[PDB]
Subunit: 399 residues, 4 copies
């Protein structure tokens, strides 16, 4: 039903390299990564100034110790004006894409004409928690809570790691250890091929880390995870969540990662005022939810909803991004929707690229735009599940 | 500009009592408080079921150790369907009002017909943080970070507590210690008067706590009773020794609480023949230099008024959030709003300030003020750390 | 074999009140408690100056965050000279008595003529530990280790709390929940009757807590004895085994703060300064067995100490068998054939408190008072310690 | 002098001394202690471990080590559950005071076979959270580094030992350069002893389960870099300081143990004694002057032993800092030609609860290599104390 609503255009997008856990980007905070992606995205739009950006929505899940309003720090660090309206969004893994939806809605209701939306996550710098210090604990051992485990990866109702609910997904939909492993191998091979062909070069903004006291500068140019594929070692590794008979493993699951992505949205009127060249048009979107432990297949609800909102049939989509929280998540949603893997994650997915949870919703959108360009497509759809039972999805047209 | 767009109706609101820091509600988590407010608000809507709610936006600032997606936990805790779309919102103190704005917009773009929005905060249960445990620290004493200070009350760019930037406001706009104290006494008096007259009874959803002694029912806000005028005037300053003007009595406290509103489209109102409490006429966000966040409402309130097509002089009551007494004094000065139209049942200095919920808390109180004082047009404005503010214009029906 | 060795005389003893966990003395550090007991004991010796103390041995178990050499801080806090030799001793619950033995041996080898020995513990101010912050721990929940549990109350081998091994002592030697409870009640009533007759007045040095910018507080009494409630005691749940448990919080010793000290002198120094000796050390004995059997290790240390002193078990007028748990005193009375009517005549640690690093010296302080009040000459003190050990000491009241 | 029964050392042993978070950091303090006790006992032909009656073991930072570190050392070494075990803390002097108490227990007849020494795992010293029981309602809190609090900070003045080392440099007139040249000389002496196999006998190598790794050498002596050492910035007083990390002792892991027997037990079992304890001396003075407390304890030990200072063939003066060795040599008139002949802790390592026993094991090796007979070990401790011991090599 977006035909009746004002149009929203993507005029640029950019992402950081995705760094490994405690890896290439672990020295940077989440707002520094976010600032980097925002600044890089704005620098691609000819005829737009960063001072033109009126409002920011930015996803961030594990915000502990990031400081007041992560999104605000992202905006100011990227050089945006202090007049810019900033809001931090948390829909767990869907945060980065819900941020873009809210951004588009803010243009559609006429409250802004230029919006930056995206997400960022530094899982390396997620802290540990001491919960009982204010009132005290008179006697007994206490727990230092891992913020990643508690606020990012554990279902609140069942107190179950997402990995265990991924095993619930493999059981419900009949995917073996071997099927998940061979999917993971294929998505690494796609990510390495895209890397080698330079197909991430446009979307990635390399990061320059100046050296400290005499030490040499470091440039981080590529995602860290794709090169780690060892097929023999992958097929032989122990399961990560269920001993012995488990089907989910560290290699066939998304890793923990650091990264950020950002898109620049403008109204039809601003496109005309500044004579900007749009990259893409947002056609529609959809959020959906179901039983929390079945979050893995919520995209099978969000994607049809988004396609209906956009007025597009599933068969007209040229490329899908289905976020690979786990290999089995992509396999199960492909099966439920009847989407062949030859249309899914054509440059690889999060199992091979990395999964900075608050950024991945926007990261897969930047990659999708690069896939449509490289494969000469027009219609694309991104969908991402989130712990708690939800999923979000968005449909774009490349222009 | 909102008058060209689909109408958004408030059909109910509710709030928890506001508990003191480590006080009457400290045993409850932020989602338990949020669920309580949401359930209470929906119970007031004749002809609407909890299963009609399609989407939830809920503010929450200090989310550490609250678990995955605090808004989702509030929704499911309140008995909403697992189909409900849930998003947590952080705009620091403005979070609870920005959540309501986002819910209105979601109705206006046609993606929902029934939306719950608000905020919650449990400052009592904010944890401390241990950084650097992943990489290690070879040798030396290490710090445990107070999450309230870090993620709630410290300006990121200058690493200054909000109360130091309140001093900046008093210096910038010329408000003395005495003017701030007299303002604080007046707003405590208004809160106590409203308390005794029962004017909070409708908006407050009391909380029953089992005993660890017999059971306790929390029915009143905890802070208003603490006013001691003589002690307030004599206490030492809280952020600048000797010369400071900002004190703990004349600042907002740390608090626990939640508030929720139920929003519906015109079509849903007509389909179910719902009785609206209020109509959203417009809103506005604004921002300026981060250490000047205290007077960002002087930008957001005219923006919300223009968006609603309502002149400032037609507003019957304002809610200017009292992050500090000097914040209300400064914004009243800059906008030329008489205090006789401001926080008529008291403000956060006297009631409490659960940061993620206060933007929604003041809207709930505003609806009550408009009814009690027989007003029609209200405006709520709230500032937030980082330099921002949010404001909303409503019409009581 | 103390007959051919130099004689060691006790010229004074003193202890703090024993405060409950997070209770009346919780604002004081272990060296503040220890300095208080040292200073008070010296104040009792007519003709001796604090500057005459040459060496200090002080027990302390949970020494984390206490700072360098707890014993040295106790000595200096009490006003002893910076020339004073100071060593901190840890034999868990036996620390305070082993310190006295080591002080006695140092006089016997001629290396000192005046020694202060004892023990202190602030279980209140025992910290928690963060053990992997140096190397780091990349992912997962971590533990904050309770220092009382880890360094005070857990057997290192089998990783069990002392209370669980107390149950083992109940099973091994056949004592019921009710028998332990009736022992607990009796020792509480003995503690309360001594409190009421002022029989602790001489050994306790009251503590004055200066009020901040707030009234002063004087702590005069041990805090635990008044807590006896026989109906609640007999009806409380077990504290270490949910189902068949027999060991309870009321019939175990509590967590406590306190210090005690004694002043030791050689034969030649006693005469040179013309001091009235309170008692004479006749012998001592350390023993050890299986760690989880530490409860009955005093049944070895006590006969050993008696043999070392040349005195017979039936000659002893009063015994102090320390009450780590009610069942500990019951089992040691059973094995050794000692009637309860000669054991802890003013109550025991179950009712008085158990500052683990101090209790070995606290019970000797109380034993000297039991000997004076009950008209006795020979006394033996015994105390087990976690890990399987025990220490015992024989004294003659003069 | 003393008129006490004879106490003989029938053996000694030490672990290699590992660097802070280095080659031994995986091991706990009682694991290192047990390793040293077991190796020491295996060297006495005719004595079984079951003959050990009592143990005194030094350990300073005992946080998170568990009940009675000395007991864990004894049982870990395979000693009988009947063995009496006491843990001793006299800060850096703990390992030598432990040996003194062990000797005294033989002398009063309460034992005929005593094991004594010390252990320390500074790598595994934890951090403290001090106010969790009563709580802290608002505000950033602090985690205490256990090393700094219980090992290296004078309780009176809240000053690290290095700052009081600067006080030593100023009091007795020792320059940055003089402290550096002492440091290089002691590193050189330790490197030479290493290459000549002179630590092979005293060191009991540690086998770590992997590929498996074997620790055979002290880790610190290879670190000497004279250029960097003379150029590095001071570590306790910026700009003008004289004390540095290279000329100070490091943080280290390690244990050492000695086996003591009475005359009667030596005769009954026909044991060949390594040495005889002749005397000892503890002394103390102003806490911030702990650096020169050995200048009191050494004369005291010598007098107790009936030995004049000039008759000592070799001294071990523990090198808590380079300036500590300089100041005590200057005050006692001891020429550097007779001090720490195989290097000291500035080059070897300084696991504080073990160092007092460590230098005694090394002193026995120095006396044998240098054809000496009378040796004296002295070690200062934070808080103002020092301990010293005199042995005769047999
Ligand atoms: C009661 C008593 O007896 S007191 C004795 C108790 N122990 C102590 O007092 C320990 C005192 N020492 C310390 O507290 C620490 O070791 C200090 C803080 C002094 C050293 O910490 P640090 O981080 O500065 O030391 P390092 O990590 O080892 O780095 C030092 C720096 O200097 C280089 N370097 C070390 N040793 C060298 C030698 N022998 N030769 C040449 N260079 C050396 C080292 O490579 C480092 O250089 P960088 O390149 O800057 O890292
Ligand atoms: C699964 C998880 C616990 C990782 O555990 P981990 O074992 O420590 O992960 P690692 O990086 O150490 O990988 C383990 C092993 O697999 C190897 N490995 C990793 N990726 C590999 C690959 N593609 N090919 C071959 N080997 C691989 C590693 O080399 C390592 O081998 P090793 O045992 O010899 O060291 C963590 O990544 C996780 O929880 N992921 C899920 C994230 C998530 O849930 N996101 C949100 C979804 S809703
Ligand atoms: C100001 C602040 C630090 C409180 O500090 P505090 O020292 O703990 O203040 P307290 O609540 O403990 O009360 C201090 C004294 O004032 C008294 N007091 C509190 N409210 C009073 C009142 N209304 N009238 C008279 N006396 C009062 C108390 O009785 C207390 O007395 P005491 O010293 O004898 O105990 C904290 O509440 C704060 O940071 N407020 C600002 C929070 C904020 O920034 N919110 C977001 C804004 S953007
Ligand atoms: C056993 C231990 C865990 C106590 O745990 P605890 O339950 O928290 O102890 P508490 O005193 O707080 O609780 C005791 C309960 O019984 C009551 N109680 C305690 N002593 C009582 C007494 N003499 N008479 C009647 N009631 C008593 C208390 O009122 C309390 O009642 P409540 O349920 O209403 O709160 C702890 O004290 C311990 O480990 N002791 C062993 C000491 C030790 O190991 N020493 C060295 C070994 S060698
Ligand atoms: Cl959800
Ligand atoms: Cl802002
Ligand atoms: Cl033992
Ligand atoms: Cl000392
Ligand atoms: N790029
Ligand atoms: N992976
Ligand atoms: N209803
Ligand atoms: N109500
Ligand atoms: N207040
Ligand atoms: N007394
Ligand atoms: N008790
Ligand atoms: N042997
Ligand atoms: N050896
Ligand atoms: N060194």
């Amino acid at each position: 039903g977006m035909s009746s609503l004002p149009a929203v255009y993507i005029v640029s997008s950019a992402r950081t390299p995705v760094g490994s856990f405690l890896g290439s980007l672990s020295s940077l905070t989440a707002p520094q990564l976010g600032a980097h992606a925002i600044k890089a995205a704005l620098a691609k739009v000819d005829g737009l100034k960063p001072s033109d950006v009126q409002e920011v929505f930015f996803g961030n899940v594990i915000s502990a110790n990031v400081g007041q309003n992560p999104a605000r720090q992202c905006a100011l660090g990227a050089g945006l004006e202090e007049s810019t309206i900033c809001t931090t969004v948390n829909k767990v893994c869907a945060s980065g894409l819900k941020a873009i939806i809210l951004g588009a809605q803010t243009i559609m209701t006429g409250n802004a004409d230029v919006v930056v939306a995206g997400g960022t996550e530094s899982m390396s710098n997620a802290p540990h928690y001491l919960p009982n210090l204010r009132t005290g604990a008179k006697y007994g051992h206490q727990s230092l809570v891992d913020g990643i485990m508690k606020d990012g990866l554990t279902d609140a109702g069942k107190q179950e790691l997402m990995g265990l609910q991924a095993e619930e997904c493999a059981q419900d939909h009949g995917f073996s250890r071997e099927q998940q492993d061979e999917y993971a191998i294929r998505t690494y091979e796609k990510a390495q091929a895209a890397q080698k062909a330079g197909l991430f070069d446009e979307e990635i903004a390399p990061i320059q880390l100046p050296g400290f006291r005499g030490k040499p500068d470091v440039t981080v140019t590529q995602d860290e995870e794709p090169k780690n594929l060892n097929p023999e070692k992958l097929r032989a590794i122990k399961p990560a969540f269920i001993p012995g008979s488990g089907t989910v493993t560290a290699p066939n699951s998304s890793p923990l990662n650091d990264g950020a992505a950002a898109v620049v949205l403008v109204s039809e009127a601003k496109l005309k005022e500044l004579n900007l060249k749009p990259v893409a048009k947002i056609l529609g979107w959809g959020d959906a939810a179901q039983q929390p432990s079945k979050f893995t297949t919520a995209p099978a609800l969000a994607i049809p909803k988004a396609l209906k909102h956009a007025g597009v049939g599933q068969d007209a989509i040229d490329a899908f991004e289905i976020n690979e929280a786990f290999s089995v998540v992509a396999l199960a949603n492909m099966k439920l929707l009847g989407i062949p893997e030859e249309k899914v994650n054509l440059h690889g997915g999060a199992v091979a690229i990395g999964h900075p949870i608050g950024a991945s919703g926007a990261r897969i959108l930047t990659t999708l735009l690069g896939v449509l360009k490289a494969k000469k497509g027009k219609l694309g759809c991104a969908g991402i599940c989130n712990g708690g039972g939800g999923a979000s999805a968005l449909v774009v047209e490349l222009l």
